[PDB]
Symmetry: D3
Subunit: 269 residues, 6 copies
């Protein structure tokens, strides 16, 4: 029934596949809506004990869809507010989910998709996976500022302020963004083992224990800090950074590859 | 004491968890004696720091399940004082005005892992292993210190999967362990650290630890811990069917058989 | 400036701590000049980021103890303004609207370690070493950023033991340092990072840094820091006998001999 | 709906708690219908604000004790979903993106007092009375909003003594009630306030309420409320002997007799 | 100064908001002068406390709408610095190391109400009236101090309804005003309070105010205030149709007529 | 067995009387020690369901004993630290008590004693009772800064920064410091009615409910704010304000009445 994702249940586990292989599984408006529908279904289904999220093929996702943004040309605070609200709330579904969520990453896991994975209870990745938040290089702000809650301040500042977007899975594991790096041929099997392990436990026990774990960070004010960063991003995008305006000016004229080249030329080699 | 050893040496107090035949499992009696020993250490002006370690080849496997099997606590009102004593005893090592050092070899699991988490520092031998197996036999987490010591993703993995073979080197990578040492060098390293602390003006150490602990307490850690404890009271007061099933096997076939039953529920 | 160098290059301000004969020790004069330089960098629209580094093959050994030995501040009212200036100067690097980058070679100790902790990023050479030796001198911690930057166990070890030889590699493992580079590549790496930042819309960088800092401020970091500072005012206002003894040796036989006396108090 | 009325008028939604023969007691069915009505109000762009009131001469006496007597929920797992529904339904009025106004006459007690506390504003007739009688019949507090709305001393008095006759004028003095009006002027005043709100750009109202609620959420209110809810789960899961005794009389002699039994335990 | 008076008397600084023809409306120039006066008062060791009051039988109607009508700021980047200056100027009175006392007669509205809320104490004449009419103008709240000063229900009523005629007596009941005095006794009462403070060791007052402010800052007030300010930047950056409509009438028929148009939108 | 307090149990209630009538029941070192012993006893006694604290005769207490301070002459941070720690921790016994605490006030309830009452779950008072925190007028700082948590910011600032020390019971009731003002002849009876009311309830229910109530304020960080104010006071007293030094200079020479006259003359009439 879905157009931009796949939804499966197997072995008491739900599996969501971000499914737009020709756009590196970029998260557009439609896909975000379907993710919410799938999470609703997984949460309502007593036969589902855990949720795996992955991308189609050998990419997780490059993040929120910039080609769709180029075409839509949202302008001003009131246009941006609902876009960012949906981005933020969809990502946070994976944190708030009463059932444990596992991100299983191949290839790129960037920007909004990096945030989606950050929100999951666990993240596993292949050696070839790479992570980061390139937003500022595009002239975009950060929608869901989970990074400093997961990896701590110095590393979060480096990744976000420089727009690091090639952080290897091994490094992501060192800093606490990734739980396990696995063999490429074994990613789906490892995610399923973890999910089925969770599925063997009394669901109430898992639910209450996750509640207690999440409470540790919520006690620190994480949800207020996240809402504050989202508010800041609304001001950023509602105004429109000249960096983003210039990026899409090049993109509409010469194409997105040319815009990326233009972007990369502004920064050191 | 019957279930611990308490020593003072070189201006340091040392508590040894002492029931090697039961992997130094923390029963009610032992918890009471730990509290008495900490009271003594805190009152003794000649003591500048506290080391906690296990007897024999182990730190501790955690709260005593055989004792729990036999006592059959049932319901919220029965479980409340058990969990309160568990929690407050572990938290003695955090709140202690003097620095506390966990010196770990072999298993350091469940309630014992939490006891070590509460100490200011943990040192471990190469052979030490850590974790929180609670959920695998239907128990909740009593003292939810883990997400305050290590990253959130790592804490969720260890607790939700009941990881109970986390090697010392990995524990060091994630910030659960300060130093990994040779098996024959544990006691010497712990004493060196404790005597180093003991060379410093005790008031300076006291006020500095106060400031260090304040950083986490400012974040609301004590409220989060109390919240997790209350959640666990509901879990245990109800009694998870996983735990009921585990103890049914344990009573019938013994703990070794019950562990086999437990492990067979999970992937190989 | 007398005790720093100030440069602007490629849209970046660079501050060099400059008293090589005293390992760039942060005295009152230098602290005032650092504030003046930060004022200049923050007011200059052509400056997009700030690099801080040291001259003479070192970053800094921290607040100046020779100056303290000579001045002999005594009591709470004398110490309050000294600590206030120390603390506020360090925190300039956190609160700076523009990104700040500590570029460290050789020693980065005590108040200078805290200065680097306050910066948005820290880069270090292979030969750089870090730590907080204060408690060994009988001094308290002025700016208790460490438990906000690294885990609680690691922060307690460094501060309670006065670790002052933490290698760059280890500092990177625990999250105190972002990148370790070759000795001759430090300036170039810091500049590449700063010029990368300088290519971005300044408002975007400003607002994003605000959001990043808000994450830690939401947790109550500024209150925890002020609390630790007030605790330190009591420590220094009273004066630890450890510090009084240290300076008694220093005035008699010199700081060199006082450090030797200090080290002999602790395990080798 | 069977147990409520839902109206839209003049750009305002109005929910009427509607079981006058039982003092509009909130049973499971009514709570479900309140949630359905709030879903409707929140989805309807023609609705700018929500009024909640009771049918007849009363707001509500709170959660339905007769229904509880008959259902005999027993243990933690039975009580968990009951309390979760109670709590989440009350908190709809806080979290509602649109402003909520409680319009109270006669009794507004226990769970109903908490429902009114959660609304953005409360207006009351001269004859209205308020409070939290829970502890007097062995029940805990489900939604611990009171100490967030009124001072700590006042909240402790009302809850620990089970005050259940707090007059509207006193409720206004302590900040539980915004305005006291004549008995014949309640509906007009509530509508005037709601239509005033309805004249304002809905987005402006929405964002301003978001900011207002943020002030209390920043203080940790939602964590404190969840903590109190978990404490209540232990209380009710265990079952206070006071409640067991109360319902024994209620089943045998009826609720009127049980209230007499209850009141005789306390000073005249 | 052009738009304020500044006096020093009896070791007290007194700032008088001074544009009687515009009800002492706070325009850009006045805000700059208030900052300059506060700088002067804070640097002057002979000043022990600060009184702020208004000229022309009024305190202030708030930020200047006539100036806003003429300037026509449009969009987020234009509004950001305007709101920043508004907010930071108001918060000068909270952060001031010395105690601040608002002495109010006649209107004290909107941004001026927020200014008074930020002061350590507020004294008012019997004829003074308070409130936050912003939402009726289609404006958001710049400085959301109200829920920190008065209860949540009362703050929501004042802000969501734009109450702008709250009498001094009522303001005292809810904790917005400390003392109500006779019209001719305001200056004398404010001066008595300020001179009382001025008799105390300045350091003692300074440190005690620090401790008092810390109570609210510990709760996260500064983060909540910054969050509300960012929400207001979105509101004003977009521009509410209510405000756009208000100024359309104001430019055509004058502010007087625009206020009449505004009032006709709401119940009489 | 006590020298400076009385301890009674009656009707399942413990009652502590601050007992130094010739010094307005001033709280000296000895009395604080005995209060801690009495609270230990009340907390250990399962027959005790609630605690009433009151003063001997028609005064509650003027606060920590200044005549004792005049004679002891504590000097410096290290001397002051344990004094303030004991002051603070004794006051906070009434907040942390697992059982409900009720302050029953006649006449003066000032300074450290005002803080003791603030810490109690409830406070009742006669019409003749008066409250406040005169510390700053003596050159002393605030030991236990509960006031802004009980009465809110504007009123707390006025009382503490001006050293208000004649706040009538009626006004104390308006601002939330006092629960009930009662007839003079009925204070002891009213406190006992309240305590016996509490005593009729399942003790576990009362205990858990108080825990939940206290958690509301502790969640806001009250204990950290209180420790911070205590730290500030250690600096204040460790240095010694010239106002306090001058006060006791007059007191040792001309007596405490003359010192109070000297003090009052510094402030407006």
């Amino acid at each position: 029934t879905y157009s931009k994702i796949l939804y499966e249940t197997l072995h008491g586990v739900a599996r969501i596949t971000l499914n737009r292989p020709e756009r590196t599984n970029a998260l557009d408006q439609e896909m975000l809506g379907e993710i919410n529908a799938a999470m609703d279904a997984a949460e309502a289904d007593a036969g589902v004990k855990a949720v795996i999220v992955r991308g189609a093929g050998n990419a997780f996702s490059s993040g929120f869809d910039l080609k769709a943004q180029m075409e839509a040309r949202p302008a001003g605070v009131d246009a941006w507010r609902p876009l960012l609200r949906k981005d933020f709330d969809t990502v946070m579904r994976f944190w708030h989910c009463p059932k444990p969520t596992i991100a299983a990453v191949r290839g790129p896991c960037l920007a909004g998709a990096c945030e989606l994975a950050l929100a999951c209870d666990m993240t596993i990745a292949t050696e070839d996976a790479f992570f980061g938040e390139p937003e500022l290089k595009f002239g975009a702000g950060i929608v869901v500022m989970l990074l400093p809650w997961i990896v701590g301040p110095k590393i979060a500042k480096e990744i976000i302020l420089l727009g690091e977007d090639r952080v290897p899975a091994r490094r992501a594991a060192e800093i606490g963004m990734v739980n396990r790096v696995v063999d490429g041929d074994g990613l789906d099997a490892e995610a399923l083992r973890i999910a089925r392990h969770i599925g063997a436990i009394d669901p109430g026990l898992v639910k209450e224990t996750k509640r207690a774990l999440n409470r540790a960070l919520e006690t620190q004010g994480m949800l207020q800090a996240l809402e504050s960063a989202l508010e800041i991003d609304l001001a950023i995008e509602g105004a429109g950074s000249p960096d983003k305006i210039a990026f899409f000016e090049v993109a509409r004229r010469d194409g997105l590859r040319a815009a990326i080249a233009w972007r990369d030329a502004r920064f050191p080699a």
